[PDB]
């Protein structure tokens, strides 16, 4: 349970975030973040940096969002990064065919006048929804007679709609491009520079914290389905012969909710497991994937996501290996962090397309295309050299993948530098062995969707007080609260301000983010306002603080609203240790006088 | 002087930044930043936050880059954000007409067989280059017979080329949009939310730190002319009746190089002035603009930009009021920080286009369109209401601006909600006075181009050592150096590592960013490597550090390469105070034994 309406009202009112271009009617899937929201987001990102980039000594890079077409063609985004879309024929309103058909089905299955066998049929359709191609989906649309859910009219046949934002780089029409749909490709393109930076050694990891774009058909669902979004993505390159993480024992004792592919197939439920046990039993393939899963868990819980509403779902054979961190919200289980485990065929693709060897290189202890120069020479004269040097760099996965088509269809076609070439029995294969080893690195890909993580934290930390007027507050951990300490002085009189100034300065010296409250009203109402945005602690300075000696102020805990009274010069250290988790509120109450004034 | 080639080699080699998509041949005006470059950039941004956002309690927001067309139409970017472009007729290579004509002229002026009077004529042409319209520029191209500078062929007549990146939001063709060319508009659209957040009071300031885009015709000049760039932009809203900054005396004593518009016109040189004097004499209009100029200076010098290569150039009548922070580089004087001072007509424009009143409101102490309902009613029937309510919200600047056209051409045309309306003598004017005051805020607009600032710091801090091999280093201030302290241990032996670990942990407790050097070679060569990226301090731990008691390590200053020897437990505090400017290197040498071993 979560009062989404009330929470959303608080989020819009205190301006954590709001619909972008609101005064222009707004734009779907686009959101502006306000001061408090920006503070929270910056805290999220900083905590993320110190977690991952700092603990793992990750190589951070910042690539461009603007990406020329060939780069995203080579990566398969031009051909495969799309959603099936259907159009109303009367007005033309676009719909994502997936969720539309799914809606129609989930509706019909839940109808009294419907047979058991058909309900079965439809369960069968849903549990295979992602395998369906264009024609299959068209047939499915016809056979279930799917109409528009607003107008009830007929729908155009499903057609592939690419989700990348299209544009043009330069003033001609010769460099068409896209806004990047992910930040991984920029890391892959810089793989050589990064490997060099790491003195040629494996393993290593690169990270990027920046925006990505996705021309979502019809965004609803708030922050969950957006068109422009900030991602925190790690690419961990490891030797496939070295799938063992030296630091796995640090997270091996963690107890996580795991939702295996087998459990999903067999209608089973997720189960709590020790991470080490899960790896030991082959639920999680290796300890690199396991390690990163564990630290993803630790990060998510650190920023305020509830453990009882957090699970890790493995991807089924139709969605290589991939575990997603999923949180339970009012929109149901949503993916917030992806974590792929796979051979980096990306490096191979870009290597072929650019003729630049993107490969690791390990020395050992001293343990193929066979073209016809003549036929290619006659076919493509001066361009034969290019076909040749293309072929001389292709890796075994590709020599295989094209050997198949060389057999079956008796062809297989490439494209290099300029354009394309149809190779047909101008080729052959070579064998034997010899010999430094070429290492095509496996990659673990943790992909953090900061917006969804933030919204999850919103839903998991939102609470209401007891009163007739339902005062709301956010149980933000101090590490991500917009700021940690509110300083509430009673007056502006120039004998108060020295205390306020000293308190602020000391708070800054102690690394406690704070803010002096110059707001209007009763103490409890001001504290209600600061609670409303999830500020963790409060220090109120009254007349007794100023005029009586020793000078003591009141420390108030956000969650409990309970207070103590302490020497104002000691409060920065207390708030520091509180926020850093060095001491509990109970530890503070046990050493300082209680205070309900 | 600056060895740009050598410096660029160091920048590319250590991967501060490099051409984006290099393996794909690269893309002009697009750059990826590597680990060291990302560290420097993050330090730049953090220092900027603490300077401006922290010192001024600025309201930070994060708006979207994706912007629908109407927003940028209302702001005048669709019609006016463009460069004049000429095309080669043979190949079609595009050129920015400005710099091309300027190049041709600057060439011809510098020719022996050229008359004095024509040189004068051309000086006259250049000193008016920005006033020329399309036809004028075409005539200028014909009359100076400008050809392609590569092929020598004829050039197409100059044509307006808009610099915004075009795209489409959603799956239709009904929401055409752009990548934002600036971040100010997102602040203007949220003006109401931000004013509310500030409890309705003026003055206040909003900030944004994020990317903007500019489809530059033909980028050369490295980081200086880019298509995608990170900006740090502040919008300071102030009551025009309150053009006085309460904190101006903090910067009033600063001595700045000021390049007035008058000095530029009269062929005069820039001159050093006390800021307060400059304001007093009307060189700088007010103390808000003056204050922000002073703190811009302070920020730029703080991050390593040389004062002797930093000036503030006022904008001439053809470029309201605007001072730009300019730095002297190998590309000459480049603009790195803009600082506009003007009435916010933007708010008025968006107010009219959206019918949403974006205005401040101050209570005092108790001191127009006159349409013809009938004529408009007959002209536009049901749409008369919309014309009406549009007219009821227009501000005096616009009632004036359209009164003029109402006279001259006897027309004037608007556009609201749906589309356009031609008003022709369906209107009139109303007068008198009465009466809370509507405040249309003046704005000071500091716009920081982080890329250019960073490159400037590169050129101003790059130096070479004396040796035959020219070892290079960067005199980065500790506050922006990639990291402050390199820890150089001699061995990996498990009696060294406790010292290294304790030193690292203590360094972290003291807020000193550091890195343990596990590199390959002599001490001096490792320190050469760390100097090469501008690391400010070094702590070398040798065998005498480990095995002899008390345990002392060596502290090495980057610039001087001079060293001292101190108790390894005291070094974190010393490095902290050094980096924070609390003590000098001389202060350290005066208290600890020298060390040239």
Swiss-Prot record, chains A, B:
Widely expressed, including in brain and spinal cord. Changing residue 148 to Y: In CMT2D; uncertain significance. It catalyses: tRNA(Gly) + glycine + ATP = glycyl-tRNA(Gly) + AMP + diphosphate; 2 ATP + H(+) = P(1),P(4)-bis(5'-adenosyl) tetraphosphate + diphosphate. Keywords: Acetylation, Aminoacyl-tRNA synthetase, ATP-binding, Cell projection, Charcot-Marie-Tooth disease, Cytoplasm, Disease variant, Hydrolase, Ligase, Mitochondrion, Neurodegeneration, Neuropathy, Nucleotide-binding, Phosphoprotein, Protein biosynthesis, Secreted, Transferase, Transit peptide. One of its GO terms (cellular component) is cytoplasm. Catalyzes the ATP-dependent ligation of glycine to the 3'-end of its cognate tRNA, via the formation of an aminoacyl-adenylate intermediate (Gly-AMP). Also produces diadenosine tetraphosphate (Ap4A), a universal pleiotropic signaling molecule needed for cell regulation pathways, by direct condensation of 2 ATPs. Thereby, may play a special role in Ap4A homeostasis. Human GlyRS uses direct ATP condensation to synthesize Ap4A, a unique amino acid-independent mechanism, in contrast to the classical amino acid-dependent mechanism for synthesis of Ap4A by a tRNA synthetase, that involves the generation of an enzyme-bound aminoacyl-AMP which is then attacked by ATP to form Ap4A. It is linked to Charcot-Marie-Tooth disease, axonal, type 2D: A dominant axonal form of Charcot-Marie-Tooth disease, a disorder of the peripheral nervous system, characterized by progressive weakness and atrophy, initially of the peroneal muscles and later of the distal muscles of the arms. Charcot-Marie-Tooth disease is classified in two main groups on the basis of electrophysiologic properties and histopathology: primary peripheral demyelinating neuropathies (designated CMT1 when they are dominantly inherited) and primary peripheral axonal neuropathies (CMT2). This is Glycine--tRNA ligase.
